[PDB]
PDB file of N, CA and C and ligand atoms in Angstrom:
ATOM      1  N   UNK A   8      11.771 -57.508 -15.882  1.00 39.64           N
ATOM      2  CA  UNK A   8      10.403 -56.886 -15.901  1.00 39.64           C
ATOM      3  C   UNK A   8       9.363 -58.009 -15.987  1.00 39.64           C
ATOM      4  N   UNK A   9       8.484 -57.880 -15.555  1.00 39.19           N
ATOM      5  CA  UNK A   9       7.130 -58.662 -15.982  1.00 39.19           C
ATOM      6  C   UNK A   9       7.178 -59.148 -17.281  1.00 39.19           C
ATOM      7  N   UNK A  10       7.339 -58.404 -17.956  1.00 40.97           N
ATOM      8  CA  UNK A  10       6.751 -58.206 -19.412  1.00 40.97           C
ATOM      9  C   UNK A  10       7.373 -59.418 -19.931  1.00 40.97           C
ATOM     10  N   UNK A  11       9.257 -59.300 -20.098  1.00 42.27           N
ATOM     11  CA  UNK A  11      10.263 -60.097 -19.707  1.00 42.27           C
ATOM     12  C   UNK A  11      10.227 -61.248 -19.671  1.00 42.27           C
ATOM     13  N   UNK A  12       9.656 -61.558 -18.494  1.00 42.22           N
ATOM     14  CA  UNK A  12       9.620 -62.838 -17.766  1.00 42.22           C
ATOM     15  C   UNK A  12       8.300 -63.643 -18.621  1.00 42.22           C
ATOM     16  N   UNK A  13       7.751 -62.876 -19.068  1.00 43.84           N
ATOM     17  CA  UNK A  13       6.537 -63.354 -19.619  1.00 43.84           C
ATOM     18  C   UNK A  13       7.097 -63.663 -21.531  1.00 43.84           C
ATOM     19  N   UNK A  14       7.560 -63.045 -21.868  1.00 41.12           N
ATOM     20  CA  UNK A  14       8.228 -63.246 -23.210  1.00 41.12           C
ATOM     21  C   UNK A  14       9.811 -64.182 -23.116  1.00 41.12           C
ATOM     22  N   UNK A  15      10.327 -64.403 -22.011  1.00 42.33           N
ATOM     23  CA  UNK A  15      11.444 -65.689 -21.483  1.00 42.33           C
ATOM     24  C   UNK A  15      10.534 -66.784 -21.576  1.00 42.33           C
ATOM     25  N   UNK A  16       9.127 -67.014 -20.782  1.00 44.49           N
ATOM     26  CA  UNK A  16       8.705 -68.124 -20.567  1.00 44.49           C
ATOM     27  C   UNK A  16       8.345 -69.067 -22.077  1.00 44.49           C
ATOM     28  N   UNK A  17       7.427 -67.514 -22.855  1.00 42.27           N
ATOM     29  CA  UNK A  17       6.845 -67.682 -24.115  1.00 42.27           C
ATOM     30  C   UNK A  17       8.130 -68.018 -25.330  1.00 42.27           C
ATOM     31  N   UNK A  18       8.985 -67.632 -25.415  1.00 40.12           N
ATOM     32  CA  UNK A  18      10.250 -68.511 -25.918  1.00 40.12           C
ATOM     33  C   UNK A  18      10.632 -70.051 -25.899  1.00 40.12           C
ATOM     34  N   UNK A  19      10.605 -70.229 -24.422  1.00 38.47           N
ATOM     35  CA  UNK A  19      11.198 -71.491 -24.128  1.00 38.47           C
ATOM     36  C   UNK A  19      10.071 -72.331 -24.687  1.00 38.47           C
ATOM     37  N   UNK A  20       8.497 -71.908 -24.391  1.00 38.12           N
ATOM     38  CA  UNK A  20       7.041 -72.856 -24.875  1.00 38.12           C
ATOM     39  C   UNK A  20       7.600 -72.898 -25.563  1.00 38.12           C
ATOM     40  N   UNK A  21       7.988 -72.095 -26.662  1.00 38.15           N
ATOM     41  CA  UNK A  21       8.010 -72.066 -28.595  1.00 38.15           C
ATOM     42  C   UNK A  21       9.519 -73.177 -29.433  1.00 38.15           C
ATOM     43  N   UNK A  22      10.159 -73.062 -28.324  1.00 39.09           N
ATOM     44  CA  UNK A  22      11.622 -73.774 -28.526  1.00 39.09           C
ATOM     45  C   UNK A  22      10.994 -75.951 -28.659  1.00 39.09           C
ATOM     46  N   UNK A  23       9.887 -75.719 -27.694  1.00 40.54           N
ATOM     47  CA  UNK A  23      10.097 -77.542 -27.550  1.00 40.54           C
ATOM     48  C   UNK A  23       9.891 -78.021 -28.634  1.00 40.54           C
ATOM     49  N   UNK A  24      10.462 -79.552 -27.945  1.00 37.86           N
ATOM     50  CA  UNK A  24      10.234 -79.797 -29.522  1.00 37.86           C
ATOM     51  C   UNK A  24       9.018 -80.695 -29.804  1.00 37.86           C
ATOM     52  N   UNK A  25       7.697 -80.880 -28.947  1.00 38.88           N
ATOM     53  CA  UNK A  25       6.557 -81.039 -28.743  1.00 38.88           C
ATOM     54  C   UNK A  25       5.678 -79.794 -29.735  1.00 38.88           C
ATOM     55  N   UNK A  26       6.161 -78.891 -29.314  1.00 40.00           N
ATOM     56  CA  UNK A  26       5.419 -77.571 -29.639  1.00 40.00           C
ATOM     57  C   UNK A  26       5.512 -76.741 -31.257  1.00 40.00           C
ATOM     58  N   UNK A  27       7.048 -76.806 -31.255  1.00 41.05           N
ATOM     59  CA  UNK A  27       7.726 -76.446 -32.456  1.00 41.05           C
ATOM     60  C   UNK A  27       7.022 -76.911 -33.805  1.00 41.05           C
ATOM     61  N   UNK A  28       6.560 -78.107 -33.820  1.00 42.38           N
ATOM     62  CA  UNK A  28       6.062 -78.352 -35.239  1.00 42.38           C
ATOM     63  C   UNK A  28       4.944 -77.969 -35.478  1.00 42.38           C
ATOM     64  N   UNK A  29       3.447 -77.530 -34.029  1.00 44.07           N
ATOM     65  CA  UNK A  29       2.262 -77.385 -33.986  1.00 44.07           C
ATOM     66  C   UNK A  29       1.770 -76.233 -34.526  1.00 44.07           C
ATOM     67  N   UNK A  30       0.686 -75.551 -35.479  1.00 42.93           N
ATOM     68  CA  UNK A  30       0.366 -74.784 -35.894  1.00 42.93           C
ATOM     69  C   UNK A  30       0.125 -73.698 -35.094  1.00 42.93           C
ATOM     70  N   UNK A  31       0.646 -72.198 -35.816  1.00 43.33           N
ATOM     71  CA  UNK A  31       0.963 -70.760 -35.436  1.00 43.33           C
ATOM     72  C   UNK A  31      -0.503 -70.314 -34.467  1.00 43.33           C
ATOM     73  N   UNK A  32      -1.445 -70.854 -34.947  1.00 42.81           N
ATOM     74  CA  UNK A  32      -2.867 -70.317 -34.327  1.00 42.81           C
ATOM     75  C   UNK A  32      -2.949 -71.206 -33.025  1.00 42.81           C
ATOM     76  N   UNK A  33      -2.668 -72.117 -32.830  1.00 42.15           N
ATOM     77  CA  UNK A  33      -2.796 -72.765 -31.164  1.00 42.15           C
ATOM     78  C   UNK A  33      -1.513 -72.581 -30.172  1.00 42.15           C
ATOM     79  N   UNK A  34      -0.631 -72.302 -30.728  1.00 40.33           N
ATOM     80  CA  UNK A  34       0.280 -71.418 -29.935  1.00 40.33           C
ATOM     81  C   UNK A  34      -0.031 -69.958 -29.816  1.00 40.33           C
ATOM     82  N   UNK A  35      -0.362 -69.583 -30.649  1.00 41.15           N
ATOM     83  CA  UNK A  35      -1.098 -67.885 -30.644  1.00 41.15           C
ATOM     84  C   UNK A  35      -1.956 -67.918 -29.233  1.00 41.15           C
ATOM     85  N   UNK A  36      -3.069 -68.588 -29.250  1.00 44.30           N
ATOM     86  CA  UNK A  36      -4.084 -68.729 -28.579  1.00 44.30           C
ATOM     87  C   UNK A  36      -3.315 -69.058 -26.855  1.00 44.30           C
ATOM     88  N   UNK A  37      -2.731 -70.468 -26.903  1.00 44.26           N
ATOM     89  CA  UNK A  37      -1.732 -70.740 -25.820  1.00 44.26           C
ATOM     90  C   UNK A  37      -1.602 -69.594 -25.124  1.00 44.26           C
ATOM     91  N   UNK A  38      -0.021 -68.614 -25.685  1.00 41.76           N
ATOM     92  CA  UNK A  38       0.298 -67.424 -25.095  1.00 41.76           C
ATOM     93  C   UNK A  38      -0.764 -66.461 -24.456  1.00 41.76           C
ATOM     94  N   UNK A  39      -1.765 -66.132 -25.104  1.00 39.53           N
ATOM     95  CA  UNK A  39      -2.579 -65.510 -24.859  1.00 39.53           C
ATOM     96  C   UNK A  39      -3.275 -66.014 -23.540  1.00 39.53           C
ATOM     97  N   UNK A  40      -3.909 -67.184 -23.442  1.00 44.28           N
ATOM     98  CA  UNK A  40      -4.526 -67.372 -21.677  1.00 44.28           C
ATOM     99  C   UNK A  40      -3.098 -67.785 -20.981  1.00 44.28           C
ATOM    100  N   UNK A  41      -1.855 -67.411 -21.443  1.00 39.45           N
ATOM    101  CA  UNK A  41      -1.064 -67.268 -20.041  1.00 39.45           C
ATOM    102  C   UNK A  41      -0.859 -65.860 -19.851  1.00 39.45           C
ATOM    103  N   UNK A  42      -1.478 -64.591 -20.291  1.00 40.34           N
ATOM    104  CA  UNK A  42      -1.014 -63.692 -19.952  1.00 40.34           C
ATOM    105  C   UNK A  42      -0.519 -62.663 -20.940  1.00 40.34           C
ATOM    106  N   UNK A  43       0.000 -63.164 -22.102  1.00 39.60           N
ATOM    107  CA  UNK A  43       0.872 -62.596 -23.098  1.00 39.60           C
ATOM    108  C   UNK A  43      -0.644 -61.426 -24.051  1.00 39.60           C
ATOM    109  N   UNK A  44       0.233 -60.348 -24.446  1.00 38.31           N
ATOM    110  CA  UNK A  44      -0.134 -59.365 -25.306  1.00 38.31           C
ATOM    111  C   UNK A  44       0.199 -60.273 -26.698  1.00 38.31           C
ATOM    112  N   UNK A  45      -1.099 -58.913 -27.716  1.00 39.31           N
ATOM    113  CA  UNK A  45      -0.253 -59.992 -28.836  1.00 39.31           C
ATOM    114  C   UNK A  45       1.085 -59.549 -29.449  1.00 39.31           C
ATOM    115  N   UNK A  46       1.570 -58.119 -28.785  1.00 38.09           N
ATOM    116  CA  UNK A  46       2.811 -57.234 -29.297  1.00 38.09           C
ATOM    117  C   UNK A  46       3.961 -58.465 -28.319  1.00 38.09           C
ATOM    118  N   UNK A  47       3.673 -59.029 -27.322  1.00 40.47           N
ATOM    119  CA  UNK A  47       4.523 -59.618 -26.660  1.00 40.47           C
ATOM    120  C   UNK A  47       4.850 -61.372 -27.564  1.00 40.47           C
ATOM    121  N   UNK A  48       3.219 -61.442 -27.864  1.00 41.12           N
ATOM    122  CA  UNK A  48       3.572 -62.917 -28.630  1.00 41.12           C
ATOM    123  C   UNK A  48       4.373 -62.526 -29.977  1.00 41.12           C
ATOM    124  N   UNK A  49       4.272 -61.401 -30.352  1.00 38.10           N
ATOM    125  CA  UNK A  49       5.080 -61.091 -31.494  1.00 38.10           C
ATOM    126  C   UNK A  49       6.241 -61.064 -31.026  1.00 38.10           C
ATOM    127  N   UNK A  50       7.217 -60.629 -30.358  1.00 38.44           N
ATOM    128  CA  UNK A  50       8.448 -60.770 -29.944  1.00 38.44           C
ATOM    129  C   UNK A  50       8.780 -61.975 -29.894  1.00 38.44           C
ATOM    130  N   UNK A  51       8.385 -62.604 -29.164  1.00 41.09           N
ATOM    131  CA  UNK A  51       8.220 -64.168 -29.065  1.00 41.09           C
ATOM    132  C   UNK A  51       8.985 -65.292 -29.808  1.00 41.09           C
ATOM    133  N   UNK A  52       7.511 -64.850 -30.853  1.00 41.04           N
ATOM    134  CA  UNK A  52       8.212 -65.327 -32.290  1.00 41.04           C
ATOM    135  C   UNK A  52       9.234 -65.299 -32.843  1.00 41.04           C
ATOM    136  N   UNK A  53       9.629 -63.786 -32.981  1.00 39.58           N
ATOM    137  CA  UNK A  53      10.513 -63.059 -33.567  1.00 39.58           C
ATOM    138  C   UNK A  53      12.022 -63.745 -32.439  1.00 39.58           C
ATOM    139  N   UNK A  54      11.739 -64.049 -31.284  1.00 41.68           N
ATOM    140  CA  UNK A  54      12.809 -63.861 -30.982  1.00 41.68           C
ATOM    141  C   UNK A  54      13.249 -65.520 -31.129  1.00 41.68           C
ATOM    142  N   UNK A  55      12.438 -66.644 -31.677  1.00 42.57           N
ATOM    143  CA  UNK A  55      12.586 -67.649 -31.713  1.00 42.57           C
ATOM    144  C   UNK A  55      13.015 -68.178 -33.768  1.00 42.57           C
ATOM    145  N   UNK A  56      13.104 -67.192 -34.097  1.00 43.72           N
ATOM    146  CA  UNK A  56      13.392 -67.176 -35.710  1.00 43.72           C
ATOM    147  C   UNK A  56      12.345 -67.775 -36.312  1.00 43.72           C
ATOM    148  N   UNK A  57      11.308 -67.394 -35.444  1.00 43.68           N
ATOM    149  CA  UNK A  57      10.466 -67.956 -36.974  1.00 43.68           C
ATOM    150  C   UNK A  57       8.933 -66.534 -36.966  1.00 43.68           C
ATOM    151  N   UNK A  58       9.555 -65.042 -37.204  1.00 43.96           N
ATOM    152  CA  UNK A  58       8.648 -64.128 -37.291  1.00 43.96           C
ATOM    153  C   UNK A  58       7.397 -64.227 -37.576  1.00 43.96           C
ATOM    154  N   UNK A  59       6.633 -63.798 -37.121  1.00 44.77           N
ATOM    155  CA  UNK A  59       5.210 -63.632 -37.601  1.00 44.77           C
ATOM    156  C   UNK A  59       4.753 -61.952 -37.710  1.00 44.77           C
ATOM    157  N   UNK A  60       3.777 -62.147 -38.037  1.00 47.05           N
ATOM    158  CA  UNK A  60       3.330 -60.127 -38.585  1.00 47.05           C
ATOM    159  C   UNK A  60       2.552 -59.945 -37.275  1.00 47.05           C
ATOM    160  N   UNK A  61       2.329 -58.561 -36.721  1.00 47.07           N
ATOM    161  CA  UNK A  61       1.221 -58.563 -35.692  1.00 47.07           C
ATOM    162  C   UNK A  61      -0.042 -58.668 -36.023  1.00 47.07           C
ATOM    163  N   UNK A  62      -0.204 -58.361 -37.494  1.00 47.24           N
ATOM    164  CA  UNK A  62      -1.415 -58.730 -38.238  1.00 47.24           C
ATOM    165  C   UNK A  62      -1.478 -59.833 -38.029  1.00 47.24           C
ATOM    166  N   UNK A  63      -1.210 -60.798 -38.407  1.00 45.87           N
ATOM    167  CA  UNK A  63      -1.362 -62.512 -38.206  1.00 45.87           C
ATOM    168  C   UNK A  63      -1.861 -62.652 -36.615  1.00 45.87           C
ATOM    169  N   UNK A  64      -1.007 -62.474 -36.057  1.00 45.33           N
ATOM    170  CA  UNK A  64      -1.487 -62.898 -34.610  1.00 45.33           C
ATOM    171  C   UNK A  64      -2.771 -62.546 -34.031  1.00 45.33           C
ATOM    172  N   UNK A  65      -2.920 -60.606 -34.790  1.00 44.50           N
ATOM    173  CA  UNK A  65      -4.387 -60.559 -34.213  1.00 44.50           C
ATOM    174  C   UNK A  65      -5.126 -60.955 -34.596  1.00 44.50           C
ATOM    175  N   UNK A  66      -5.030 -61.508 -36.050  1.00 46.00           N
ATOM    176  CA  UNK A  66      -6.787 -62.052 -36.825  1.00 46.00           C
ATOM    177  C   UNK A  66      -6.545 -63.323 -36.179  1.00 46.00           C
ATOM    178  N   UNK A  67      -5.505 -63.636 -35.730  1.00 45.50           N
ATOM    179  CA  UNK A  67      -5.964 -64.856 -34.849  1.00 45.50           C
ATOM    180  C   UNK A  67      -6.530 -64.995 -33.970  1.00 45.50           C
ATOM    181  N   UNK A  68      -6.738 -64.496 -32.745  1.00 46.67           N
ATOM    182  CA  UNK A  68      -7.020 -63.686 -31.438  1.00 46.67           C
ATOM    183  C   UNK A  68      -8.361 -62.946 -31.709  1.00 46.67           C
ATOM    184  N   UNK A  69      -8.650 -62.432 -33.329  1.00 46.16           N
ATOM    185  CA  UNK A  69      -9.727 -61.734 -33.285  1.00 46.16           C
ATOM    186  C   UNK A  69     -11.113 -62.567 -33.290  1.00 46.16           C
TER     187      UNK A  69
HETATM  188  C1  6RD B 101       8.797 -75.643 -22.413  1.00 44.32           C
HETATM  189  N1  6RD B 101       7.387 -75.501 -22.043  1.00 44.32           N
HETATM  190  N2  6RD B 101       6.960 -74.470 -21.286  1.00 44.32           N
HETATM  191  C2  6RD B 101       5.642 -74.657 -21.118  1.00 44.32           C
HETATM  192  C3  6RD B 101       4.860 -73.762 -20.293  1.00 44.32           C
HETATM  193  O1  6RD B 101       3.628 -73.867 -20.402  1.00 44.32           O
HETATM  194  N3  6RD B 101       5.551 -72.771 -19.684  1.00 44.32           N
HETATM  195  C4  6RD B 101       4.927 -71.736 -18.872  1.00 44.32           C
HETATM  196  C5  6RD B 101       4.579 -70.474 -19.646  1.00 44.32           C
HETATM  197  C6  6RD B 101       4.645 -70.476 -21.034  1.00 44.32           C
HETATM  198  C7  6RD B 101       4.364 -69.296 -21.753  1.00 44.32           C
HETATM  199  C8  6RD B 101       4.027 -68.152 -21.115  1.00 44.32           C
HETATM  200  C9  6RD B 101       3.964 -68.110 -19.680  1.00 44.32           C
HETATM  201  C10 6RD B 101       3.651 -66.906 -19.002  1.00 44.32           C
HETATM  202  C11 6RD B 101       3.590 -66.895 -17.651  1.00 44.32           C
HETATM  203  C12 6RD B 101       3.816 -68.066 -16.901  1.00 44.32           C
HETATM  204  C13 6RD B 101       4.127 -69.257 -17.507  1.00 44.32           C
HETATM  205  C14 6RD B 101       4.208 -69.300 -18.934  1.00 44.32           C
HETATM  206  C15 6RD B 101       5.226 -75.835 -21.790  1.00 44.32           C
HETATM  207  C16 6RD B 101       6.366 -76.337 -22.366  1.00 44.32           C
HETATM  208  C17 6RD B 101       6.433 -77.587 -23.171  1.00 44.32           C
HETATM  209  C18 6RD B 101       5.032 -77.981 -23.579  1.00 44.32           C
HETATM  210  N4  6RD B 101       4.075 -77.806 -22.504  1.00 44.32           N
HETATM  211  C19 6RD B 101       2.854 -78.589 -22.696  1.00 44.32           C
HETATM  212  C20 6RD B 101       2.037 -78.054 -23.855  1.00 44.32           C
HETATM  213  C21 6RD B 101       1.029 -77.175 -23.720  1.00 44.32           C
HETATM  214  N5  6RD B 101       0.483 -76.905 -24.971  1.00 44.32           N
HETATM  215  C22 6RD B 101       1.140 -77.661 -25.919  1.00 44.32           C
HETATM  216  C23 6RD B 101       0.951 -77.750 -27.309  1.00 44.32           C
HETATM  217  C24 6RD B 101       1.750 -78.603 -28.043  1.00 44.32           C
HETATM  218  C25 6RD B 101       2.688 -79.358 -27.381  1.00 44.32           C
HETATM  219  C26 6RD B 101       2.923 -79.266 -25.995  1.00 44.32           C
HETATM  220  C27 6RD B 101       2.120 -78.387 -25.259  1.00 44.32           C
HETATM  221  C28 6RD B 101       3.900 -76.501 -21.935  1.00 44.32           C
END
């Protein structure tokens, strides 16, 4: 699916190891001008073991 492909890509960002140490709010932001929801950047996270709340993400975004 779209959606998918868009939460595969947003994984692999979150995996480097460039990226991995950089704070939750500029990766938040990142995902977001490629496309990503913030229910999608929440998966994301989640699917990279290091969860975040959807609350968090949106007062980020907000
Ligand atoms: C494994 N990886 N994938 C990307 C990358 O931007 N992938 C494409 C992508 C990533 C996330 C979502 C996408 C949705 C649709 C199409 C493409 C998407 C980057 C990386 C490694 C780091 N890249 C440079 C980078 C960009 N921002 C950074 C912040 C801290 C450290 C490095 C960076 C960027």
């Amino acid at each position: 699916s779209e959606r998918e492909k868009r939460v595969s890509n947003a994984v692999e960002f979150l995996l480097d190891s460039r990226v991995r140490r950089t704070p939750t709010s500029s990766k938040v932001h990142f995902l977001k001008s490629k496309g990503l929801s913030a229910e999608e950047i929440c998966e994301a996270f989640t699917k990279v073991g290091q969860p975040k709340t959807l609350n968090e993400i949106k007062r980020i975004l907000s």
